[PDB]
């Protein structure tokens, strides 16, 4: 008499409006078994009209008792079967066609980690929706957001259950009144579908993560974890066997490497350590030391080796960044101390959730003395300080944390929250994302940001630059910084931004245990070229 009308789930779009998450119509035939005269005769009559198989009966027979107590006689119907039922409606008074919506992901595994998936509501979801006091709003709703955007914006994408006053027999005949459902709100993402597809291609067979951001907005133009899987098979109610196949793959397709991969950031951190050392005044632009290719922990027999076996010689910070000198940063770490260095890296967001609008995230670890006492029950030694100076030791970060620290550097200490939401459709208007956070590290006019970035310019462009090979011929100027994180094979890391002059793209990439094939600087150049040439 008064019944719930399920609202349709909001759609998800890329930055140009390409649909990424769609609803499809599934037609099924339904009746109330009691309100039927000759059920067993009626079913035999339906065989020819909607191609009703023995298995359509079996699956209905199994449902009639299992149902507390309408049941699906046949599910799914072809339009042809619906059309043959509709002209024979008068012959089956107690039987109607019902239209339902099932989520569809047309680019599948290219966007599994970003978009996620919706899955069938289970007892645990029911309990939790009860506790939250919104279970009535899920009365006609089958699926809910379990990963990615589908999860983080579940409340935006779901909408409002409506009500209809209807008359029966025992199938609906007409509608007395209707309180419309309000459709879920559509979400437009910052994602560039073309860039995303292109990057999943480049990573093929690598365990990898890439984050591409626009540093003027903090919008995420691409977010790739490789290896991936088909999100569609979770809408289909994933089997135990398929889930276990995913859960036990050693490549770990289930893990979003971009937001849950925790790795040593290695030498990618040296630009932020420079800015911090300069701002704390522990060095100046000019502060020079001589590198013989190793460094003695002063007052102790520990030797720390530079990557360059016979050293870089006389280094200022600029040259230490261009050549990725370890010796210069071992000194800077020693002088700064863990307390000031941990505190400054925390300002860059290391050890912190980034604020990205996904619920699948790890914070990693910006080590402190307090933390080491707490976790490992020993106190902090000078030994512990030194590897932290080159982004190793207890220091772990996510690719999304590395993307955020770079955006902060590009914007001279003005922090952008990385974000996937470009706009929400509210009442037929696209309402843009607005950053709520307004953090500022040191002073915008310090010119210390510039020293660190001129360093990175040098890595890419100057003949002593460690990355000069990857960026030969560019019509734009790129700024970059690489790193190698050992654990068999070392992880390879690069961060980069372009036009150096006025950056419109920044990239953070890690190839786990090196590239399956290509080098991280090859891949970074291919990404910057894709966006800035074409
Ligand atoms: Br609707």
CA of 174 to the centre of ligand 1 (A): 19
Is residue 94, in this structure, part of any structural domain at all?
Answer: yes
The sheet carrying 162-167 orders its strands as: 2-5, 162-167, 174-179
Q: How far is CA 216 from CA 418, 452, 481, in A?
A: 11, 19, 20
Sheet holding 491-498, edge to edge: 219-226, 208-214, 505-511, 491-498, 479-485
Among 189, 207, 225, the domain boundary falls at 189
Residue 265 belongs to what H/E stretch? none
Q: Centre a 10 Å sphere on the Cβ of residue 473 and count the other Cβ atoms it contains.
A: 6
Cβ neighbours for 207, distance < 8 A, ≥ 6 positions apart: 226, 227, 251, 252, 257, 511, 512, 513
Cα distance between residue 414 and residue 452, in whole Å: 15
Residues 176 and 203 in one domain: no
Tally of structural domains, the chain: 2
Q: How far is the CA of 66 from the centre of ligand 1 (A)?
A: 30
Establish if 248 belongs to a structural domain. no
Ligand 1 centre distance from Cα of residue 183 (Å): 4
User: Exposed/middle/buried for 192, CB within 10 Å: 0-12, 13-18, 19+?
Assistant: buried
Please check whether residue 392 lies inside any domain of the structure: yes
Tokens of 30: 């339904």
Q: Which of the listed residues 174, 189, 204 is the one where a domain comes to its end?
A: 189
Dist. CA 142–CA 408, nearest whole Å: 42
Range of the domain at 141: 2-189
Instruction: Judge if 158 and 231 occupy the same domain.
Output: no
- 158 CA from centroid of ligand 1 (Å): 10
CA distance 455 to 278: 13
Tell me the CA–centroid distance for residue 187 and ligand 1, in Å. Answer: 16
Q: Tokens standing for 183? A: 């459709």
Distance between Cα 138 and ligand 1 center (Å): 14
Domain assignment present for residue 333? The answer is yes
Q: Are residues 11 and 109 in the same domain?
A: yes
The verdict on 127 and 216 lying in the same domain is: no
Instruction: Measure the N-to-C terminal CA separation of the chain; round to a whole number of Å.
Output: 59
The reply to whether 326 and 234 lie within a common domain is yes
User: Is residue 248 helix, strand or coil?
Assistant: helix
> Both 185 and 209 in a single domain?
no
In DSSP terms, which residues pair with 164 in a beta bridge? 3, 178
Alpha helix positions (H), 133-175: 148-152, 154-158
- What is the CATH classification number for the domain harbouring 233? 3.40.710.10
Our measurement of the distance from residue 91's CA atom to the centroid of its chain's CA atoms, rounded to an integer in Å, reads 53
Q: Which helix (H) or strand (E) holds 427?
A: none
* Domain finish residue from 154, 174, 189: 189
Catalytic residue check, 267: yes
DSSP 181: P
- Please tell me the distance between residue 15's alpha carbon and the centre of ligand 1 in angstroms: 24
Taking the centre of ligand 1 as the mean of its atom positions, its distance from the CA of residue 189, in whole angstroms, is 22
**Which tokens go with 223?**
């977010």
113 shares its domain with 41: yes
Domain membership flag for residue 220: yes
Report the phi/psi class of residue 185: left, alpha or beta, with left for phi > 0 and alpha for psi in -120 to 50.
beta
Give distance in angstroms: CA of 166 to centre of ligand 1. 18
Note whether residue 295 is domain-resident: yes
Return d(Cα 285, Cα 456) in angstroms, integer: 15
Residues 324 and 424 both lie in one domain? yes
Handedness of CA 204, 210, 214, 219 (dihedral sign): positive
- Structural domain contains residue 251: no
SS3 of 135, please? helix
Cα of 11 vs centre of ligand 1, distance in Å, is 12
Query: Annotated catalytic residue: which of 225, 267, 405, 423?
Result: 267
Are 212 and 37 in contact by the 8 Å Cβ rule? The answer is: no
| Same domain for 409 and 262 | yes
CB 453 within 8 A of CB 500: yes
What's the resolution in A?
A: 2.3
Q: How far is the CA of 263 from the centre of ligand 1 (A)?
A: 44
Which CATH number goes with the domain that contains 52? 3.90.1310.10
Least Cα distance to 402 among 508, 260, 528, 259 occurs for 508
Which residues does 461 contact at the CB level (< 8 Å), separation at least 6?
Answer: 468, 471, 477, 478
Collapsing DSSP states into helix, strand and coil, what is residue 198?
helix
- How much distance in Å is there from the Cα of 8 to the middle of ligand 1? 5
Q: What SS3 state is found at 518?
A: coil
Paired with 30 in beta bridges are 72, 96
DSSP string, 445-492: T-SHHHHHHHHHHHHHHSTT-TTGGGGTT-SSPPEEEEEEE---PPEE
Q: Same structural domain for residues 97 and 220? A: no
163 and 225 share one domain: no
94: which residues sit within 8 A by CB, 6+ positions away? 31, 32, 35, 36, 37, 42, 169, 170, 171
Domain assignment of residue 249, yes or no: no
What DSSP line would sit under 291-331, residue for residue? E-SEEE-SSSS-EEE-SSTT--EEE-HHHHHHTT-HHHHHH
Q: State whether 130 and 204 are in the same domain.
A: no
């Amino acid at each position: 008499k008064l019944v719930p009308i399920a609202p349709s789930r909001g759609m998800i779009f890329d930055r140009n409006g390409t649909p990424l998450a769609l609803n499809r119509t599934i037609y099924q035939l339904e009746l109330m078994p009691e309100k039927i005269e000759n059920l067993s005769a009626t079913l035999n009559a339906l065989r020819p009209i909607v191609d009703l198989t023995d298995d359509d009966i079996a699956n209905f027979e199994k449902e009639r008792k299992r149902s507390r107590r309408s049941i699906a006689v046949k599910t799914p119907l072809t339009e042809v079967q619906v059309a043959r039922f509709a002209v024979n409606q008068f012959r089956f008074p107690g039987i109607e066609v019902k239209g339902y919506q099932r989520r569809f992901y047309p680019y599948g595994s290219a966007l599994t980690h970003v978009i996620g998936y919706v899955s069938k509501i289970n007892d645990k979801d029911v309990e939790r929706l009860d506790k939250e006091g919104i279970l009535p709003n899920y009365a006609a709703t089958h699926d809910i957001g379990k990963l990615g955007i589908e999860r983080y914006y579940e409340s935006t994408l779901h909408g409002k259950t409506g009500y209809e006053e209807v008359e029966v027999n025992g199938r609906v005949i007409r509608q007395l009144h209707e309180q419309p459902p309000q459709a879920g709100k559509d979400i437009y993402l910052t994602l560039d579908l073309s860039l995303q597809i292109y990057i999943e291609k480049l990573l093929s067979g690598s365990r990898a993560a890439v984050v591409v951001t626009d540093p003027r907005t903090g919008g995420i133009l691409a977010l790739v974890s490789n290896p991936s899987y088909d999100p569609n098979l979770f809408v289909d109610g994933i089997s135990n066997k398929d889930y276990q196949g995913l859960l036990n793959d050693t490549n770990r397709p289930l893990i979003n490497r971009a937001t849950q991969g925790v790795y040593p950031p290695a030498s990618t951190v040296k630009p932020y350590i420079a800015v911090s050392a300069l701002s704390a005044g522990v060095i100046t632009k000019n502060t020079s030391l001589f590198d013989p290719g190793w460094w003695q922990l002063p007052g102790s027999e520990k030797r720390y080796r530079d990557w360059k076996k016979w050293g870089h010689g006389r280094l200022n910070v600029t040259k230490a960044l261009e050549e990725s000198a370890d010796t210069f940063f071992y000194q800077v770490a020693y002088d700064m101390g863990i307390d000031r260095l941990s505190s400054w890296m925390s300002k860059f967001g290391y050890g912190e959730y980034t604020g990205i609008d996904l619920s699948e995230e790890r914070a990693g670890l910006m080590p402190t003395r307090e933390w080491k006492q707490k976790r490992h029950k020993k106190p902090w030694y000078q030994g512990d300080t030194i590897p932290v100076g080159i982004g190793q030791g207890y220091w772990t970060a996510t690719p999304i944390q590395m993307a955020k620290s770079l955006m902060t550097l590009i914007n001279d200490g003005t922090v952008k929250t990385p974000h996937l939401l470009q706009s929400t459709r509210i009442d037929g208007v696209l309402v843009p994302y607005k950053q709520e956070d307004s953090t500022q590290i040191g002073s915008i006019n310090s010119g210390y940001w510039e020293i660190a970035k001129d360093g990175m310019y040098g890595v890419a462009n100057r003949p002593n630059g460690t990355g000069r090979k990857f960026f030969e011929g560019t019509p734009y100027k790129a700024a970059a910084k690489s790193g190698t994180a050992q654990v068999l094979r070392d992880h390879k890391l690069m961060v980069a931004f372009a036009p150096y002059e006025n950056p419109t793209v920044s990239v953070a990439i890690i190839l786990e245990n090196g590239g399956a094939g290509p080098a991280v600087g090859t891949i970074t150049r291919q990404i910057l070229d894709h966006i800035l040439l074409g």
